[PDB]
Design a protein around this ligand. Sequence first.
Ligand SMILES: O[C@@H]1[C@@H](O)[C@H](O[C@@H]2CO[C@@H](O[C@@H]3CO[C@@H](O[C@@H]4CO[C@@H](O[C@@H]5CO[C@@H](O)[C@H](O)[C@H]5O)[C@H](O)[C@H]4O)[C@H](O)[C@H]3O)[C@H](O)[C@H]2O)OC[C@H]1O
Ligand SMILES: O[C@@H]1[C@@H](O)[C@H](O[C@@H]2CO[C@@H](O[C@@H]3CO[C@@H](O[C@@H]4CO[C@@H](O[C@@H]5CO[C@@H](O)[C@H](O)[C@H]5O)[C@H](O)[C@H]4O)[C@H](O)[C@H]3O)[C@H](O)[C@H]2O)OC[C@H]1O
Ligand SMILES: O[C@@H]1[C@@H](O)[C@H](O[C@@H]2CO[C@@H](O[C@@H]3CO[C@@H](O[C@@H]4CO[C@@H](O)[C@H](O)[C@H]4O)[C@H](O)[C@H]3O)[C@H](O)[C@H]2O)OC[C@H]1O
Ligand SMILES: O[C@@H]1[C@@H](O)[C@H](O[C@@H]2CO[C@@H](O[C@@H]3CO[C@@H](O)[C@H](O)[C@H]3O)[C@H](O)[C@H]2O)OC[C@H]1O
Ligand SMILES: O[C@@H]1[C@@H](O)[C@H](O[C@@H]2CO[C@@H](O)[C@H](O)[C@H]2O)OC[C@H]1O
Ligand SMILES: O[C@@H]1[C@@H](O)[C@H](O[C@@H]2CO[C@@H](O)[C@H](O)[C@H]2O)OC[C@H]1O
Lengths: 429, 429
Amino acid sequence: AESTLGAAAAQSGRYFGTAIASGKLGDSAYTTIASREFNMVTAENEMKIDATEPQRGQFNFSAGDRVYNWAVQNGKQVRGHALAWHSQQPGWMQSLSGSTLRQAMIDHINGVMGHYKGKIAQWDVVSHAFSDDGSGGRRDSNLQRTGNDWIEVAFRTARAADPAAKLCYNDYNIENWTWAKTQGVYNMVRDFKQRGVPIDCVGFQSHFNSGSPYNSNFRTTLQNFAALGVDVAITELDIQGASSSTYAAVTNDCLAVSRCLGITVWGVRDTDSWRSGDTPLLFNGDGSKKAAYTAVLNALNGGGGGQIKGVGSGRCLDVPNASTTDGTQVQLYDCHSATNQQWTYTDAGELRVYGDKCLDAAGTGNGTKVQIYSCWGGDNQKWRLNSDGSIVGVQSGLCLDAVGGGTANGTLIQLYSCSNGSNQRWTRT
Amino acid sequence: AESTLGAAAAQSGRYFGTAIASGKLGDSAYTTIASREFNMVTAENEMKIDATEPQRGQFNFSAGDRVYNWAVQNGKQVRGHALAWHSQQPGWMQSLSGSTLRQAMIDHINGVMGHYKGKIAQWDVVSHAFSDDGSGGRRDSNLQRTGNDWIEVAFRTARAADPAAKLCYNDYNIENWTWAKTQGVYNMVRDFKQRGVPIDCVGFQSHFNSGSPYNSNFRTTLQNFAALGVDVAITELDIQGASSSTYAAVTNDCLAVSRCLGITVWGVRDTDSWRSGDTPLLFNGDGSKKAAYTAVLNALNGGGGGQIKGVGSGRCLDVPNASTTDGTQVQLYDCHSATNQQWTYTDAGELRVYGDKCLDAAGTGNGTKVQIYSCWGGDNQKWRLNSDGSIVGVQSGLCLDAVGGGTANGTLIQLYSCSNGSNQRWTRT
Ligand SMILES: O[C@@H]1[C@@H](O)[C@H](O[C@@H]2CO[C@@H](O[C@@H]3CO[C@@H](O[C@@H]4CO[C@@H](O[C@@H]5CO[C@@H](O)[C@H](O)[C@H]5O)[C@H](O)[C@H]4O)[C@H](O)[C@H]3O)[C@H](O)[C@H]2O)OC[C@H]1O
Ligand SMILES: O[C@@H]1[C@@H](O)[C@H](O[C@@H]2CO[C@@H](O[C@@H]3CO[C@@H](O[C@@H]4CO[C@@H](O[C@@H]5CO[C@@H](O)[C@H](O)[C@H]5O)[C@H](O)[C@H]4O)[C@H](O)[C@H]3O)[C@H](O)[C@H]2O)OC[C@H]1O
Ligand SMILES: O[C@@H]1[C@@H](O)[C@H](O[C@@H]2CO[C@@H](O[C@@H]3CO[C@@H](O[C@@H]4CO[C@@H](O)[C@H](O)[C@H]4O)[C@H](O)[C@H]3O)[C@H](O)[C@H]2O)OC[C@H]1O
Ligand SMILES: O[C@@H]1[C@@H](O)[C@H](O[C@@H]2CO[C@@H](O[C@@H]3CO[C@@H](O)[C@H](O)[C@H]3O)[C@H](O)[C@H]2O)OC[C@H]1O
Ligand SMILES: O[C@@H]1[C@@H](O)[C@H](O[C@@H]2CO[C@@H](O)[C@H](O)[C@H]2O)OC[C@H]1O
Ligand SMILES: O[C@@H]1[C@@H](O)[C@H](O[C@@H]2CO[C@@H](O)[C@H](O)[C@H]2O)OC[C@H]1O
């Protein structure tokens, strides 16, 4: 349709996936969100080395199939993660080196891909191969020590194991074009195409935080890699803070590159995140959509301080007598130029007034008063501005409502079940 | 003395306490904070009715004493809580009614106060006596039905039991002077004082949140009760969101009333709170001091938009070329009127620039670069403004530092072990 991420993404020929954790599929709230919003799936850990080959030569796909089965059963495609890398290697593989490790690497690829032959759309054949020391060179691991040619071997090996799959190179901190790591990966992919090494895509994990923040030049990076003759994909997206603007900007970068297959966010709810502390996903603990979700959905569909006029009463959201007192319920009044009517929507999804006061709801049920309270980040102060013009309380899940459909000055604002009514739509100015 | 809350408050003859949970006195991380920051203690539950008299006439002081001893052995006074109220009554008292209840109430008071006779500074003789129905009348409880004079009786009983302890009436939602409930309590205490009813104080639980927000008239309330000849005390303070200003405001209201004995916060760390979802205390779960902690400390020691100038350099905190790019490290620069030099300290402990950008630290160690990043509420975007001029990151516990003690334009800002150096002191005007 256009009401869920997967569907909106499809309007541009793209997909929108998430990372599924089999241990959570038993959680109905989890599966309800995951099944409805995404049309692409990645196993968070079930298809990795230690999970698929517990002992040398002994393969094990019970965990992986558990995820795969759920995906196909729910009309989702699957991304294979990951075939050859230094992290999460089972004990036995960690003790290997030289040609012994090299062949173990090849045997692992053959075993996993053979089992999933023709069922996986994309395979992260190699991941985390470059360093972060800022040199843009190869990562120093037991795999790289077997010879610089190990990555090329894994790809030729993967192409032979399942010709139907797209073979991707996956890595993080390669989104900023100015970072050496990014360029090092570009030169390798470039080298591969020139020599005819099988490689169909580059996956940019996209784990953004204040350590390695999103930079708008990410679009040039996608363009650049796409120009090498490969498809690009945002594979493990999550943003510390979950800024609406940052999440919206990444969505647009991909929509600007025809070779960008889609976006996968690393998880469903912040509580499921490997970095829940950074609350970097689109849904939060209770399964409610975050400000960033709306921003992402809006971007997929096409897309400072100001006033919030209610298209249906003509009056603006106003703080009674321009009070600065916490607990003051807002009202509707004749739009004019005064700070008591200037609302700023933040990347956190707050409707700030006076700079540090936040549109607040002291409850969740219908009839709950909408007031101003010191900003502290509570979901009861977070909002989602829907494209239809409604403002939904992230925590309540209710729309800002003009009491008794009133339209006269002094009409209080309240929380009520959304109705698409005129007393629930607004326009920014 | 003024490096800890207890000592700072002691400067003015007051105390700063907390609520101790017997179950955590074996948690060194917990006791390390508690024993250092407070000089007044209240058993969070150990001294309540159900806890001290599990069977009528059969008293159990095992847990109360554990807390009482820990307190005295650690230089803290003790507030008994609570002797006669409707909540948390053992199952056998709830069933009681009429004169048999009145008698039980009397005996409980004598039994418990007898045990602690002479050891308790303050006793919450009666608590939660008034309703929240707007009429300013007594809440309808099995105790109130035994006769409206139960409160007076409990107090006369208490006085006789321990003439040495200060007897307080305790309640919530009686901080706002305009509320009916507050007036009801006011009249009762005023009536008691005139008739000679032995009540020495009124405790204001002070549980503030968007539901029952703090209001500056709280001081007026305190001042009015004090005028009646009874001491006042903030007994169970906690503020939803832990706003710096609100916490400092409550502290100054008590400093403003000579009869205000002191302030008690209902818990040590947010994780210990009965309402952790509201992160209403002064210490985070990891034990680090929150922005509000310093706001209170500074206040105890006597005490929108602007420049932050370095003392040692004479230059201001500046964002290179007014960039709004996340990850941009800030520097020192000749002070001038421009938005890339106007920082706003919010109640959340943030230092905002451009309205929605936050002073950000991407790590917790020395040499961590200080930059701007979209505001989202992380502890690495919260700061404490020490009274010495230094600015300490909440999460890191590190000071803003002008690299290498540089004083020239272009000197970058980093995190570093606080040293009282002039490249770590700042004056904001
Ligand atoms: O359940 C868990 C799985 O979810 C988990 O999945 C893996 C998560 O993502 C990938 O692995 C991690 C990628 O991010 C790495 O951390 C980087 C390190 O660099 C930071 O930036 C640095 C800032 O300072 C500079 O000086 C420096 O040069 C920069 O590099 C960046 O901000 C961090 O995000 C982690 O170490 C990786 O583990 C991987 O694809 C997923 O499979 O796996 C574990 C499982 O338990
Ligand atoms: O370990 C736990 C102990 O910590 C715990 O200690 C007791 C906790 O409760 C304390 O008393 C509480 C005071 O606050 C009450 O809630 C008020 C109710 O009113 C709300 O505001 C209303 C909003 O709606 C409006 O219409 C209405 O007019 C407003 O009044 C306000 O926001 C809430 O905070 C609690 O119900 C009381 O329990 C007590 O003193 C402590 O000793 O005990 C349990 C133990 O396990
Ligand atoms: O217990 C406290 C002590 O820890 C504290 O120690 C002081 C800490 O600051 C020291 O001065 C620092 C030294 O580093 C400078 O920055 C570095 C400059 O070179 C760069 O390459 C590097 O990246 C920067 O990190 C910093 O500007 C400067 O302030 C000081 O000498 C120590 O004594 O002292 C107080 C104790 O109570
Ligand atoms: O008790 C309630 C009153 O406090 C409440 O007062 C309203 C305060 O706002 C008045 O309108 C202002 C006109 O000027 C604009 O600039 C302001 O933004 C408006 O808020 C309004 O007329 C007052 O009634 O009224 C309702 C009472 O129950
Ligand atoms: O207290 C009353 C409210 O409960 C009432 O709420 C209305 C319910 O229907 C919705 O369609 C309206 O938008 C909403 O205002 O409003 C009147 C008020 O007195
Ligand atoms: O030379 C450059 C500096 O100019 C820049 O900082 C700006 C200097 O001019 C001031 O008016 C601006 O406020 C300030 O941000 O920093 C980078 C340095 O290379």
